[PDB]
Design a protein around this ligand. Structure first.
Ligand SMILES: CCCCCCCCCCCCCCCCCC(=O)OC[C@H](COP(=O)([O-])OCC(O)COP(=O)([O-])OC[C@@H](COC(=O)CCCCCCCCCCCCCCCCC)OC(=O)CCCCCCCCCCCCCCCCC)OC(=O)CCCCCCCCCCCCCCCCC
Ligand SMILES: COC1=C(OC)C(=O)C(C/C=C(\C)CC/C=C(\C)CC/C=C(/C)CC/C=C(/C)CC/C=C(/C)CC/C=C(\C)CC/C=C(\C)CC/C=C(/C)CC/C=C(/C)CCC=C(C)C)=C(C)C1=O
Ligand SMILES: CCCCCCCCCCCCCCCCC[C@@H](O)O[C@H](CO[C@H](O)CCCCCCCCCCCCCCC)COP(=O)(O)OCC[N+](C)(C)C
Ligand SMILES: CCCCCCCCCCCCCCCCC[C@@H](O)O[C@H](CO[C@H](O)CCCCCCCCCCCCCCC)COP(=O)(O)OCC[N+](C)(C)C
Ligand SMILES: CCCCCCCCCCCCCCCCC[C@@H](O)O[C@H](CO[C@H](O)CCCCCCCCCCCCCCC)COP(=O)(O)OCC[N+](C)(C)C
Ligand SMILES: CCCCCCCCCCCCCCCCC[C@@H](O)O[C@H](CO[C@H](O)CCCCCCCCCCCCCCC)COP(=O)(O)OCC[N+](C)(C)C
Ligand SMILES: CCCCCCCC/C=C\CCCCCCCC(=O)OC[C@H](COP(=O)(O)OCCN)OC(=O)CCCCCCC/C=C\CCCCCCCC
Ligand SMILES: CCCCCCCC/C=C\CCCCCCCC(=O)OC[C@H](COP(=O)(O)OCCN)OC(=O)CCCCCCC/C=C\CCCCCCCC
Ligand SMILES: CCCCCCCC/C=C\CCCCCCCC(=O)OC[C@H](COP(=O)(O)OCCN)OC(=O)CCCCCCC/C=C\CCCCCCCC
Ligand SMILES: CCCCCCCC/C=C\CCCCCCCC(=O)O[C@H](COC(=O)CCCCCCC/C=C/CCCCCCCC)COP(=O)(O)OCCN
Ligand SMILES: CCCCCCCC/C=C\CCCCCCCC(=O)O[C@H](COC(=O)CCCCCCC/C=C/CCCCCCCC)COP(=O)(O)OCCN
Ligand code: SF4
Lengths: 70, 71, 175, 83, 156, 115, 105, 98, 318
């Protein structure tokens, strides 16, 4: 045997492993490695646009700390 | 703070558009620059065709379809 | 000017309406109506109408399926027609397409008035309001207000649905 | 009150699905009226600040309106913290 | 050369793909169909070889003539053979399908299915044992392996 | 944009699969091969003849019922109103009406298929 | 004809939806709240016949807010002259209208 | 008015003409009716969304509901017509004259 | 970089479908006291590759009486819908973060059956027409019940966003709250994907392969791929909806592994049910769904509407 079904299932699991984590990795690689922002409502989109405008490099994920206000 | 910044940004965009319209409309014989289309004299919120009217296509796309297309 | 996405969707909408409005063997009419419903769902999606678009798409899909079963049962012939299998169907389809294209060209090139008023063009992105929203969704709140504000609408709608069930039963009773 | 018991017996023996569905529907209809927690749900719904609270212009005759968010006056959400 | 190696490898790959997965059509006529069933039984389990039954002729590769082919049935057998898309193979099972068998001299029996359809493998017996039919299927697999289509096309 | 790109990619992949399926293998089609499939013999009538529907009434009732879910789907958002009593009353009223319509169909032998 | 029972009984069966500026949920305002309110206050009481002559200004402003026909006409004229000038070669639009703007929060 | 509104009006007019033409069948005219309902729904929701009429967002849904009723009604009648003639052709509905 | 994500979501799903065919064959074989495919490769690992290569190198057949455009369009639509309905799934981060994911899934699932309908109608054979009619009856039977079950389950979530289902059941699985709805939803998904005992649209013993009886080599393979992808996707959706896993934002691999394991368990359960029971009758399925599932579904919808108000536990995110 009954365990001879275990190999194929394992391979299938490996395939189902591929998308999820990959997406996560892609998101990180595209957003400075910090869990790409979710904008469900207009307020969150406005926050993202404000960050993009004040970043100075046209990237919303480049956050500015207290060192940017003298 | 966001409200204050939004008001200042909208006013700056409107002023830039008005200055540019004054520049362009100079040779038009019967044009009054900055003329309102409403009989009233109170404040009317811009239409987004008045803010990003003279700007590029990418800015317009981000302004109008930016939020809806973000997934 | 802005990728003409809404304009392209509206054109496909009208094309599907022409396709199913020439009455070519309702199977293909059903396909045309499904295409038009999906494209209209996309159109209202582009305007912020998510729930309304998804609802109209689902309702039509369910409705179309019943229609397909019904044409298989009652409205079929030995040689079902298509847009190129009949002179009349092809004539109607081509006339609709040509007149739609003519109207589009006249409205794009000139500020022409056809029936209602003059044409503007310059994309539909201009009319969008610059106002921002909160943590809620405007359409979602408007629709959800049906249960707190629209008591009368809910009452008449429920009564109409119950009477409709009774009515279809009585009509199909037979005798 | 005697024949209804026999009818319930017969319905449970023959069509239990209908009996269960009717019982669940009846419970869902009656129970919310008797529950003391409905007012708490309404209060929680009313306490959610979706929109900005516009300040009131001070005319000097507003004793119950706080002058600052940390002032003791105004509504309190202390009952929510214990729920 | 270079093209010869490529066409040989491609032909080997295609032959392996067609050989490893044969889908016979659910089609039995007489006694031999019981042994065909017993081939699918757990003891022999033809499925483990990639051989799985499919009902529709359009989704079938092999036609196994298991039983007597009467005159009333011959048009139906030819029809279902014609509707099988190529490549297709025919395996003749039992004496009745091979050459008439016990009913060779009867007035209503086709003396062999090879008069109606071209046959690839002839399996003898009455009925052939499930092992005999499995051996015939393996011989058909070997015959498919020996086939050379792309190699012949290259030398044209 | 992302959803449109996803739809285009999926449709392109399916179309490419169909094209490879239709252009790679050797095609040898003759008249007898492409005939309509009956079990072993030629079809008597045609597949375009009317096919009786024994559940037409159930289909129409499904048409009417498919809008009840459309009305009931905004309930998660309607749950966030201030006056929950009216919302609850109207939702329960709508569900009772749906149940009553289903019961009325059931008792009058409306769910039974035609003989 | 119009057997008005709502005003007689004070029921408000369908008057909550008639106009755009009447108690929307969560106080969400319409796009033309101010213009519609102004027109309604102007035209209330005088009557239907007078409201088409004395409150014509308010109705015109409300319609302009609704459809923005004049605004789009003005914008199209400005854009037409702008593109004619750029084709002739005298405009040279400023950098902040081309993508070189210094953005502000 | 933008091009989207005019395209929706054009779709409604095309569907109305298709309903009024009555080629051969009866299902096709019902399909034209549902197309008219769909165009009305799309235009109504576009208008409601453009002007931020919050309370009117529930108006299209109610529309759809009654659309269903109409559709159901038509289908019911069609069945009877078939049961009287074996074909949903409109040429058979000629027992009553003017 | 988005196309890389699209490909990384597309190709593994197809590979998983291909190997699920082999897993199902071996599982059925071992539950039938035999071995199943173990000859082509080591423990039969190369069987799906041989199957696909055989199917795509075989002559594709088109009937003479068939309507061509629909006949070719239907498999494309089926496969496209099967691949598309995977994007909004949070694993734990969805590829497309829709505000209304559940409604999108319902609409796309409703559109999927039109591939079966159009293939059956365009095949222009009696068995294909009967298969299409059976599909129509099946969807008429299950659609309303499925939608009401989804609404009742999501009444405790607070929205239609699929990502919120991860944080809704951070502490306790939702199966402990709505297990009757869980069972009814499981049966509805069994009927939705056209699986035993509700696999009436094919009817191997009755309609000799049913609607796809005329699809020879490539489009038949695409239909098979679409069906198996729909099986896996529906089981993943059920796992997310009813069996929520623990998501740590700094290591999503744990959530991905848990979710994949739950999906595989549900798929094995699907194969188990297929091997265990005989087949329903396509009128008995409608009678079951409209006389036993609809009343309980309506009652539980009323109960789940009343419960949050009754206990003052209304979910957030209006
Ligand atoms: C201009 C207006 C818009 C044009 C649309 C496309 C252009 C049409 C050009 C021909 C199309 C069909 C080819 C053909 O005629 O036969 C070729 C040829 C015929 O040879 P034959 O066997 O001797 O002829 C058999 C008989 O003549 C009888 O054979 P038959 O009965 O099969 O032929 C009838 C067929 C021929 O068509 C016609 O009769 C006239 C063509 C007008 C079609 C337009 C009708 C409007 C329908 C609604 C709007 C659709 C979208 C329009 C927008 C397009 C812009 C993006 O009619 C159709 O089936 C049209 C269906 C196409 C609609 C596809 C939409 C998919 C819906 C999926 C659901 C949507 C979800 C929501 C979104 O067959 C082949 O070569 C094999 C391949 C054919 C099929 C390939 C794929 C399907 C066609 C792709 C269409 C575009 C889809 C995107
Ligand atoms: C006594 O009286 C008599 C009878 O009365 C009893 C009779 O009855 C009778 C007639 C009966 C006879 C004809 C004999 C009939 C035999 C029996 C009745 C039954 C025997 C066997 C049965 C059919 C039961 C079978 C059931 C089993 C469980 C077998 C498994 C069933 C299968 C159908 C399920 C598996 C499905 C198939 C294997 C197809 C799957 C393959 C896929 C389509 C391919 C994979 C998909 C790909 C396309 C994926 C591609 C994606 C890629 C990316 C992958 C990678 C590829 C790249 C190249 C990398 C006679 C004659 C008779 O005298
Ligand atoms: C980013 C990572 C993603 C991972 C996804 C999850 C895992 C996916 C992997 C799928 C596993 C497939 C099963 C493989 C089992 C091993 C088979 C092997 O042991 O057998 C060999 C098979 O060898 C094959 O070459 C290996 C093929 C396995 C890869 C095919 C999987 C399909 C996806 C990619 C296709 C590209 C194929 C490139 C190689 C031909 C023996 O054949 P061969 O050595 O020959 O002997 C005959 C030739 N002689 C006579 C001269 C000796
Ligand atoms: C779209 C991307 C993929 C494209 C296609 C690639 C698909 C993956 C390739 C799969 C590899 C497996 C093939 C062979 C497996 C080894 C099995 C071995 O045993 O086969 C032997 C020999 O097999 C063949 O010699 C090997 C065929 C492989 C040919 C290599 C081709 C590489 C792929 C190249 C694809 C594209 C080429 C570039 C131009 C575009 C004969 O064995 P057989 O007697 O039966 O069985 C024995 C039965 N027993 C066990 C009972 C005793
Ligand atoms: C897995 C998903 C991703 C896959 C990615 C790859 C995509 C592959 C694209 C799909 C096509 C591949 C199929 C493999 C064979 C090619 C099919 C066709 O295109 O070739 C011939 C098409 O050619 C035509 O016969 C005539 C061609 C003459 C016109 C020339 C084309 C215009 C170019 C101008 C010439 C200049 C030089 C050309 C080279 C650059 C077909 O001829 P035909 O006999 O019907 O069909 C039988 C094919 N058989 C033999 C293989 C069974
Ligand atoms: C008075 C005339 C009686 C004879 C005529 C009878 C025929 C008509 C049938 C019934 C008339 C409907 C009148 C209901 C009008 C709604 C307004 C009122 O009822 O208050 C509502 C209260 O509604 C209550 O729930 C009671 C209505 C429920 C009616 C029960 C259904 C049975 C009606 C009978 C006909 C239905 C079909 C047949 C059923 C068997 C909402 O008040 P509230 O929420 O504070 O304010 C909302 C505005 N906010 C949000 C800004 C605050
Ligand atoms: C999703 C998973 C599956 C993906 C689908 C695509 C799989 C691709 C597998 C490639 C394997 C190689 C296929 C080769 C077999 C082609 C079909 C065939 O056998 O045709 C034989 C035919 C014989 O014809 P004749 O002898 O001249 O005429 C005799 C009749 N009068 O030979 C040929 O002409 C074909 C020549 C080679 C074709 C080119 C193949 C090159 C590889 C392309 C693969 C494309 C994949 C992308
Ligand atoms: C290579 C040149 C490809 C040309 C393809 C044009 C269509 C065509 O006629 O191809 C013919 C060919 C059959 O011809 P044969 O004579 O049998 O083969 C000749 C070689 N022996 O037919 C096909 O294979 C058609 C292939 C499909 C074309 C792709 C377009 C399909 C469009 C479908 C759109 C519907 C999508 C719906 C899903 C969207 C929903 C969200
Ligand atoms: C085919 C059926 C089309 C169905 C499309 C459904 C897509 C969808 O619902 O996603 C909505 C998605 C997510 O937004 P929200 O949920 O509101 O929240 C996040 C934003 N803050 O919104 C969007 O991205 C909208 C973007 C445009 C929608 C795409 C429209 C395309 C419709 C299909 C047309 C296909 C071509 C037409 C002809 C077909 C046959 C040739
Ligand atoms: C106003 C309150 C409503 C709220 C509750 C209800 C919510 C929704 C639930 C109802 C859904 C619709 C139900 C439709 C009823 C149809 C009844 C019917 O006609 O079916 C009978 C069968 O049903 C009957 O046997 C008659 C009624 C059976 C009892 C029904 C419920 C009676 C009361 C039960 C609950 C009592 C209170 C709960 C007590 C719990 C125990 C302490 C016909 O039998 P067939 O299956 O068609 O054919 C059989 C032969 N082949
Ligand atoms: C204190 C307040 C509480 C309020 C009440 C809440 C509790 C409610 C209590 C009742 C719950 C009952 C739920 C039952 C669900 C309905 C099922 C049903 O009744 O239908 C069956 C029929 O069900 C079936 O036959 C379906 C067969 C399909 C089999 C599929 C595989 C078997 C099960 C596999 C494992 C199940 C896994 C479930 C969860 C999966 C993980 C999500 C009966 O029908 P018939 O026997 O035909 O009778 C009608 C004629 N008199
Ligand atoms: S060969 Fe023998 S066993 Fe086989 S069908 Fe003929 S008589 Fe029966």
């Amino acid at each position: 045997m009954w365990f001879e079904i275990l190999p194929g299932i394992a391979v299938m699991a490996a395939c189902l492993f591929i998308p999820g984590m990959a997406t996560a990795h892609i998101h990180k690689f595209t957003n400075g490695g910090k869990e790409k922002r979710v904008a469900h409502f207009s307020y969150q989109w406005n926050l993202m646009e404000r960050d993009r405008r004040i970043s100075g490099v046209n990237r919303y994920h480049v956050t500015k700390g207290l060192e940017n206000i003298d | 703070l966001f409200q204050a910044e939004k008001d200042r940004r909208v006013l700056q965009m409107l002023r830039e558009n008005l200055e540019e319209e004054a520049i362009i409309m100079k040779d038009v014989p019967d044009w009054k620059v900055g003329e309102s289309v409403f009989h009233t004299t109170r404040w009317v919120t811009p239409m987004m065709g008045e803010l990003y009217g003279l700007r590029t296509n990418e800015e317009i796309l981000s302004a109008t379809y930016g939020f809806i297309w973000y997934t | 000017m802005t990728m003409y996405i809404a304009f392209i969707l509206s054109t496909i909408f009208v094309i599907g309406f022409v396709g199913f409005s020439s009455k070519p063997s309702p199977i293909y009419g059903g396909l045309g109506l499904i295409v038009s419903g999906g494209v209209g769902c996309g159109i209202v999606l582009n305007f912020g109408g998510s729930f309304l678009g998804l609802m109209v798409f689902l309702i039509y899909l369910g409705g179309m399926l019943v229609v397909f079963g019904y044409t298989t049962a009652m409205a079929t012939e030995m040689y079902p027609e298509v847009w190129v299998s009949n002179k009349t169907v092809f004539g109607a389809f081509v006339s609709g397409l040509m007149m739609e294209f003519c109207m589009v060209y006249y409205a794009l090139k000139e500020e022409e008035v056809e029936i209602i008023f003059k044409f503007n063009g310059l994309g539909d992105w201009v009319i969008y309001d610059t106002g921002d929203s909160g943590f809620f969704s405007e359409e979602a709140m408007g629709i959800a207000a049906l249960y707190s504000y629209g008591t009368w609408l809910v009452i008449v709608t429920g009564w109409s649905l119950l009477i409709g069930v009774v009515v279809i039963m009585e009509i199909t009773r037979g005798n | 009150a005697g024949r209804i018991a026999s009818f319930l017996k017969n319905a449970w023996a023959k069509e239990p699905v209908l009996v269960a569905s009717f019982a669940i529907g009846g419970l869902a209809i009656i129970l919310p009226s008797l529950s003391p927690y409905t007012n708490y749900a309404i209060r929680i719904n009313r306490a959610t600040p979706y929109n900005y609270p516009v300040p009131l212009r001070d005319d000097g005759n507003m004793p119950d309106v706080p002058s600052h968010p940390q002032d003791p006056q105004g509504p309190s959400l202390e009952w929510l913290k214990n729920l | 050369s270079r093209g010869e190696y490529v066409v040989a490898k491609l032909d080997d790959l295609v032959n392996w793909a067609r050989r490893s997965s044969l889908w016979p059509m659910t089609f039995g006529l007489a006694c031999c169909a019981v042994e065909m069933m017993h081939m699918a039984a757990p003891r022999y389990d033809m499925d483990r070889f990639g051989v799985v039954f499919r009902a529709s002729p359009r989704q079938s590769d092999v036609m196994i003539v298991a039983g007597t082919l009467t005159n009333k049935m011959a048009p139906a057998l030819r029809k279902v053979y014609d509707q099988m898309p190529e490549p297709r193979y025919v395996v003749s099972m039992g004496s009745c399908a091979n050459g008439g068998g016990y009913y060779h001299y009867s007035y209503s029996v086709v003396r062999g299915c090879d008069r109606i359809v071209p046959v690839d493998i002839y399996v003898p017996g009455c009925p052939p044992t499930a092992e005999a039919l499995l051996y015939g299927i393996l011989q058909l697999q070997r015959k498919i392996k020996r086939e050379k289509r792309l190699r012949i096309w290259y030398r044209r | 944009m992302n959803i449109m790109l996803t739809l285009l990619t999926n449709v392109t992949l399916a179309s490419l699969l169909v094209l490879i399926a239709f252009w790679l293998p050797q095609l040898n089609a003759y008249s007898e091969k492409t005939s309509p499939y009956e079990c072993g013999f030629d079809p008597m009538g045609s597949a375009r003849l009317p096919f009786s529907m024994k559940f037409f009434l159930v289909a129409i009732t499904f048409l009417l019922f498919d809008l009840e879910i459309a009305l009931l789907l905004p309930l998660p958002w309607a749950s966030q109103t201030n006056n929950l009593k009216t919302m609850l009353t109207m939702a329960l009223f709508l569900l009772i009406l749906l149940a009553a319509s289903l019961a009325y169909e059931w008792t009058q032998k409306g769910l039974e298929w035609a003989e | 004809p119009f057997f008005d029972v709502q005003k007689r009984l004070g029921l408000d069966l369908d008057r909550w939806m008639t106009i755009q500026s009447a108690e929307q949920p969560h106080k969400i305002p319409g796009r033309c709240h101010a213009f519609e309110k102004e027109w309604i206050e102007c035209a209330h009481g005088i009557g239907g016949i007078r409201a088409e002559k004395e409150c014509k200004i308010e109705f015109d402003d409300f319609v302009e807010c609704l459809l923005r026909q004049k605004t789009m006409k003005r914008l199209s004229a400005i854009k037409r002259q702008r593109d004619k000038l750029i084709k002739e070669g005298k405009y040279t639009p400023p950098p902040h209208h081309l993508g070189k703007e210094d953005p502000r929060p | 008015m933008p091009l989207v509104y005019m395209n929706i009006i054009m779709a409604f007019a095309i569907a109305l003409a298709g309903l009024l033409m009555y080629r051969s069948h009866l299902m096709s005219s019902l399909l034209c009716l549902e197309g008219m309902m769909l165009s009305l729904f799309i235009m109504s929701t576009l208008i409601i969304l453009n002007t931020h009429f919050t309370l009117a967002n529930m108006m299209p849904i109610i529309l759809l509901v009654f659309a269903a009723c109409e559709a159901a009604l038509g289908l019911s009648l069609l069945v009877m017509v078939s049961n009287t003639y074996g074909t949903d052709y409109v040429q058979n509905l000629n027992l009553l004259q003017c | 970089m988005f196309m890389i994500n699209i490909l990384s979501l597309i190709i593994p799903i197809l590979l998983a479908v291909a190997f699920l065919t082999l897993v199902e064959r071996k599982v059925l074989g071992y539950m039938q006291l035999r071995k199943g495919p173990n000859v082509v490769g080591p423990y039969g690992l190369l069987q799906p590759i041989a199957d696909a290569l055989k199917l795509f190198t075989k002559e594709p057949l088109r009937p003479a009486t068939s309507s061509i455009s629909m006949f070719i369009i239907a498999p494309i639509l089926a496969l496209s819908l099967a691949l598309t309905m995977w994007v909004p799934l949070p694993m734990p981060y969805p590829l497309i973060n829709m505000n209304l994911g559940v409604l999108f899934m319902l609409a796309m699932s409703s559109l999927a059956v039109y591939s079966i309908l159009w293939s059956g109608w365009a095949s222009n054979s009696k068995y294909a027409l009967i298969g299409a009619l059976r599909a129509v009856a099946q969807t008429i039977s299950y659609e309303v019940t499925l939608a009401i079950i989804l609404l009742s389950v999501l009444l405790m979530n607070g929205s239609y966003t699929l990502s919120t289902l991860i944080t809704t059941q951070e502490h306790i699985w939702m199966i402990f709250t709505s297990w009757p709805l869980a069972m009814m939803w499981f049966i509805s998904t069994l009927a939705e994907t056209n699986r035993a005992p509700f696999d009436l649209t094919e009817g191997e013993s009755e309609l000799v392969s049913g609607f796809n009886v005329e699809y020879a080599a490539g489009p038949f393979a695409m239909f098979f791929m679409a069906e198996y992808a729909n099986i896996i996707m529906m089981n993943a959706f059920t796992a997310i909806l009813f069996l929520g896993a623990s998501h740590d934002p700094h290591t999503p691999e744990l959530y991905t592994i848990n979710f994949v394991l739950k999906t595989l368990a549900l798929t094995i359960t699907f194969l188990w049910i297929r091997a265990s029971y005989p087949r329903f009758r396509y009128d008995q399925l409608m009678h079951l769904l409209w006389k036993s599932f609809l009343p309980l579904t309506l009652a539980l919808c009323m109960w789940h509407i009343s419960l949050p108000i009754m206990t003052a536990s209304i979910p957030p995110q209006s």
